[PDB]
């Protein structure tokens, strides 16, 4: 008790320093940033808030623990007030309440007592200006607490938080409208909680009402004030509207637009993965293979850990349907290894034309396939493997007989061997000629690709894309 | 051993000598483009470090 009793005082000063300077310096800094300039945005604290909360999402959030009483939530939420520079005294009052935790008996004002606290910024008379600071006071205390996931009786409190956070949406659309630029700051802030809107429902049930609320918020941002707002809502769309039926595949056609400009970076790279699984069930391989490969190289930076790793696993699903793939252990990670072991030997059975090995993989690894939901391909991937084998033989041989290719690919019958090549020319797999007597397959080499003609036609798209990057460089150089 | 440049024909039994050794467009280009990758990779240390 004496040793553990003296170790309690030191830690809470640590959140009283760095966590104190998190929302007070950024919020107090964004104060003058949102009063003017306000170019663009920028508002560099908006992306700085991303460097904080995401760091808070690991440690310490608001809590912890930390051997405090979790009185940081009621601390900053009261006495905003606010006014002219005397608000600096409110930060001084926030320091005076720090000593209350370390001197008197500390009590927990969170949970049941947070309902009157969320109404305080409106009851302080008044905010009077920045909703995001109240939105932050309605999020940074409450939203990092959701990662506890106790699920008992506080889920409705997370719903009551979104109720007053929807009252902030009432002040979001109605208030300002004159050179606002605070919605663009909220478009990053309101996205997070809107992702938490899904997280709160996903632990109970799918949201039927918020889907209608999504289309209401989706169209109301167009065209009046939209920056990154419709794109973040489009992420909420394709996320749940994919996993849940139905018709939402073709729904993307009327939403695009694009929506330009893609913001920000990897946000649209994983979006290309979301619409990539769409095109994966659409069976179009050409557009699906380019959107998945682009999603890998355009997604920074990790670690950690399996977020980018597990999302890359299902990303090569379109590559398993291409018919030309190498072994996937080059994308393997030691942390993702044990998880992809059923998915590892999978593509090993794709590289082989063996029917016994392909069926044994589905039978043994079917337990892992149930959590993936990938069974759509396993029925038609047999035809993809036989195209990998026939392309391997046709590229390695000029003439290939139907009797020799029968047992080597264990087709066992001449009739279906003719049915494979008949629809191979329909699919453009091979130019192999067939002379019908018994019959046999006598083909000839394909040529005339050469150098001059076709490779120079591709160079037209190569350089026209290169000079577009010149335009991308001119646009980027002109911002500073 | 490069001492003899030519190719034979087994069917009709004719040894045909043909050569076009010099290419100044491909070799002087591709070698520099591979070197151009080394110029960017060495600059990737400047790029990533100055940003973060």
């Amino acid at each position: 008790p004496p040793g553990g009793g003296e170790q309690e005082p030191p830690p809470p000063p640590a959140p009283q320093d760095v966590e104190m300077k998190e929302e007070a310096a950024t919020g107090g800094g964004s104060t003058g940033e949102a009063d003017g300039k306000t170019a663009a945005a920028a508002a560099e604290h908006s992306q700085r808030e991303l460097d904080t909360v995401t760091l808070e999402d690991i440690k310490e959030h608001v809590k912890q623990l930390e051997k405090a009483v979790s009185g940081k939530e009621p601390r900053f939420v009261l006495r905003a007030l606010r006014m002219l520079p005397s608000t600096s005294r409110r930060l001084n009052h926030y320091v005076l309440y720090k000593a209350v935790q370390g001197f008197f008996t500390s009590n927990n004002a969170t949970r049941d007592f947070l309902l009157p606290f969320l109404e305080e910024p409106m009851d302080t008379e008044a905010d009077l200006q920045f909703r995001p600071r109240t939105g932050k006071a309605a999020s940074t205390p409450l939203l990092p607490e959701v990662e506890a996931y106790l699920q008992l009786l506080v889920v409705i409190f997370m719903m009551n938080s979104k109720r007053y956070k929807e009252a902030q949406k009432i002040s979001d659309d109605l208030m300002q409208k004159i050179s606002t630029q605070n919605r663009r700051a909220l478009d990053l802030v309101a996205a997070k909680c809107y992702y938490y809107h899904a997280r709160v429902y996903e632990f109970l049930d799918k949201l039927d009402v918020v889907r209608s609320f999504l289309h209401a918020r989706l169209r109301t941002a167009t065209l009046r004030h939209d920056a990154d707002g419709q794109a973040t809502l489009l992420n909420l769309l394709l996320r749940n509207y994919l996993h849940y039926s139905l018709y939402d595949q073709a729904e993307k056609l009327v939403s695009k637009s694009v929506f330009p400009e893609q913001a920000n970076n990897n946000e649209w790279a994983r979006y290309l993965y979301y619409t990539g699984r769409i095109k994966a069930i659409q069976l179009e391989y050409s557009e699906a293979r380019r959107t998945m490969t682009n999603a890998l190289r355009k997604a920074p930076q990790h670690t950690a850990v399996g977020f980018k790793q597990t999302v890359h696993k299902l990303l090569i699903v379109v590559e398993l349907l291409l018919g030309e793939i190498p072994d996937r252990l080059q994308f393997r990670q030691p942390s993702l290894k044990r998880s992809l072991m059923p998915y590892f030997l999978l593509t090993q059975a794709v590289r082989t034309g063996n029917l016994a090995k392909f069926n044994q993989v589905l039978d043994q690894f079917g337990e892992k396939f149930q959590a993936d939901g990938t069974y759509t391909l396993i029925i038609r991937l047999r035809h993809n493997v036989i195209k990998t084998g026939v392309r391997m033989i046709s590229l390695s041989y000029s003439r290939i007989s139907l009797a020799d290719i029968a047992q080597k690919l264990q087709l066992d019958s001449p009739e279906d061997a003719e049915f494979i090549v008949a629809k191979a020319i329909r699919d453009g797999v091979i130019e192999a000629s067939i002379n019908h007597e018994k019959g046999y397959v006598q083909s000839k080499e394909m040529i005339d690709i050469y150098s001059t003609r076709e490779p120079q036609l591709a160079f037209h798209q190569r350089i026209s894309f290169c000079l577009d990057i010149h335009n991308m460089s001119v646009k980027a150089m002109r911002f500073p | 051993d490069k001492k003899f440049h030519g190719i034979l024909d087994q069917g009709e039994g004719v040894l045909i000598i043909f050569d076009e050794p010099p290419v100044d467009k491909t070799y002087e280009a591709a070698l520099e483009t591979i070197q151009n990758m080394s110029k960017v990779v060495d600059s990737l240390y400047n790029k990533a470090k100055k940003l973060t």
Binding site: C466, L467, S473, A476, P480 | A29, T33, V40, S43, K47
Partner: peptide
């Protein structure tokens, strides 16, 4: 061929050196 080959290297001279020199002055000014 001389078009596409050289323009790709000219782009490598235009794109790289610009982003370097621009990232230098931009972020170190403020």
């Amino acid at each position: 061929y001389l078009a596409s080959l050289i323009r790709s290297v000219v782009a490598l001279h235009n794109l790289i050196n610009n982003k370097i020199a621009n990232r230098d002055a931009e972020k170190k000014e403020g």
